[PDB]
Design a protein around this nucleic acid. Structure first.
Length: 94
DNA sequence: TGTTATCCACAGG
DNA sequence: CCTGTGGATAACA
């Protein structure tokens, strides 16, 4: 699984643009999908936190680490996030 | 308002 | 390098 693939898939899935994933915009409508894309990058690939960060608009590796934890948390608190996680992995590992 | 996604300064594996 | 921690803060909800 490649990061570029994850970004395109996630963008389409949430009906937003790949550029939104790279953008510094923090609005939840795009930051959530972004965090989901970053967490997937970490769970689906062997890329380090710094490499995933660079891959998402030059973000710090700690931001990716935060993303992973936030998505972990949300997966436990929201059935919809839990579903998006499953749906996306289903697609990406096809 | 209160919350948080992001970056920075560090640090031992 | 890598993964983590502690802290600030500008953006968010």
């Amino acid at each position: 699984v490649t990061i570029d693939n994850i970004q395109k898939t996630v963008a389409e899935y949430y009906k937003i643009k790949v550029a939104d994933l790279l953008s510094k915009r923090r609005s939840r409508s795009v930051a959530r999908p972004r965090q989901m894309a970053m967490a997937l990058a970490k769970e689906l690939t062997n890329h380090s936190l710094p490499e995933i960060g660079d891959a998402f608009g030059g973000r710090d590796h700690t931001t990716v680490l935060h993303a992973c934890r936030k998505i972990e948390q949300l997966r436990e608190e929201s059935h919809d996030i839990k579903e998006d996680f499953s749906n996306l992995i289903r697609t990406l590992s096809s």
